[PDB]
Ligand binder design. Structure first.
Ligand SMILES: *[C@@H]1O[C@H](CO)[C@@H](O[C@@H]2O[C@H](CO)[C@@H](O[C@H]3O[C@H](CO[C@@H]4O[C@H](CO)[C@@H](O)[C@H](O)[C@@H]4O)[C@@H](O)[C@H](O[C@H]4O[C@H](CO)[C@@H](O)[C@H](O)[C@@H]4O)[C@@H]3O)[C@H](O)[C@H]2NC(C)=O)[C@H](O)[C@H]1NC(C)=O
Length: 361
């Protein structure tokens, strides 16, 4: 089984213990570590942070301890305008320029592959995305003639039914990608004024209409559209989504007024690292959706939807049972990487729980 783990650049800037550098990463934890995110300049792949080539080097030295570890560099991301990706892929010339710049860059910095985080292709992009994947893979096939191990090509893809139908030709890109990471953790959000979980495993026979916003539906749909289970990797959260309640009600459907108050370390409204949630739990009331198989907690007027060791192990068994290639974790810097916030002296409790199940039969 594969255990794909993302590490984010901007996490080096968090204060105190929140600060996370590549060397905090256990070399034997994951099978693949992906550095997010690279940028695109003058239609060529490029660094993002001022110290990226230093962090690239730090990350890739982990391979000195675990020779089987593979690393990839992810291009795109949220702070990367989808339109920008759009313009690059639409024209044969700018596309070909981008494709040619990738191998040397990866070879120079020591990466084993490229991860595409085009978020998200619209209706007009579908055909170009296919073109980008095909041609990028062909270039990787060509570059390997030089005697070096062929570069890997992966992509992070929406788990939303409508997003999938709109921007992806799953049957086509599946044959060219080494693995597809399903972003099965964006099923709810603070864009809608009600309380709900962003990463439920199952539908839940209650207040419905979605019936598509759960990991089980997403996996099934991808398999039906033509993607081989052996290339699918299910995404597992290491963060939680928070809400500010508009009333004293805490159960399903509870009125929301906006995002939750920022965490001391992550400083972003609407989300909390798992290590911040461990602290948040002291004095909070914990609950669990029986049907969806995921937990949530409340304290004062704060409502948090998150994943714990049990829900994550649960998700891992589910993907083993559907015979998928593995799991993807977003992100290592959001898990209790120091291992000093969550109680049981253990580094990366969430990611380790996934690994244990995967190492199981
Ligand atoms: C990721 O990679 C992207 C893509 O390269 C970077 O984004 C580009 O970065 C530069 C610097 O941040 C920006 O450059 C240029 O801005 C001036 C022109 O911008 C115009 O802005 C007006 C808006 O009022 C708009 O009407 C025009 O359409 C145009 O966009 C330009 O004059 C600036 O300067 C130069 O001027 C002369 C050469 O003409 C030279 O003497 C100077 O030294 C200098 O080179 C500058 O070049 C650009 O606006 C920005 N655009 C995009 C696509 O975002 C990112 O910085 C990268 N991200 C990270 C984190 O690095």
């Amino acid at each position: 089984y594969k255990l794909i783990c993302y590490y984010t650049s901007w996490s080096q800037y968090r204060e105190g213990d929140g600060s996370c550098f590549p060397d905090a990463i256990d070399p034997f934890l994951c099978t693949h570590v992906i550095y997010s995110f690279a940028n695109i300049s003058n239609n060529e792949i490029d660094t993002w942070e001022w110290n990226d080539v230093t962090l690239y080097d730090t990350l890739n030295t982990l391979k000195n301890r675990n020779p089987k570890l593979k690393t990839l560099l992810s291009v795109g991301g949220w702070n990367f305008g989808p339109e920008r990706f759009s313009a690059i892929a639409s024209k044969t010339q700018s596309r070909r320029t981008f494709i040619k710049s990738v191998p040397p860059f990866l070879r120079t910095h020591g990466f084993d592959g490229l991860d595409l985080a085009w978020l998200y292709p619209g209706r007009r992009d579908k055909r170009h995305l296919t073109t980008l994947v095909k041609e990028m893979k062909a270039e990787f096939i060509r570059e390997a003639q030089a005697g070096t191990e062929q570069l890997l090509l992966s992509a992070a893809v929406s788990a939303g039914k409508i997003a999938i139908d709109r921007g992806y030709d799953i049957a086509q890109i599946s044959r060219h990608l080494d693995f597809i990471s399903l972003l099965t953790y964006d099923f709810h959000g603070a864009w809608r004024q009600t309380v709900g979980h962003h990463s439920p495993l199952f539908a839940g026979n209650e207040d419905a209409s979605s019936r598509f916003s759960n990991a089980d539906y997403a996996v099934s749909y991808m398999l039906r559209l033509g993607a081989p289970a052996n290339k699918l990797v299910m995404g597992i959260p290491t963060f939680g989504r928070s809400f500010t309640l508009a009333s004293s009600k805490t159960d399903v459907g509870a009125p929301v007024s906006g995002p939750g108050v920022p965490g001391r370390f992550t400083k972003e409204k609407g989300i909390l690292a798992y290590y911040e949630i461990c602290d948040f739990l002291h004095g909070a009331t914990t609950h669990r959706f029986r049907d969806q198989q995921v937990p949530y907690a409340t304290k004062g007027n704060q409502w948090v939807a998150y994943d714990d060791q049990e829900s994550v192990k649960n998700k891992a068994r589910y993907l083993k049972n559907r015979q998928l290639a593995g799991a993807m974790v977003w992100a290592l810097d959001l898990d209790d990487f120091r291992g000093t916030f969550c109680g049981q002296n253990l580094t990366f409790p969430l990611t380790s729980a996934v690994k244990d199940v995967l190492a199981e039969v």
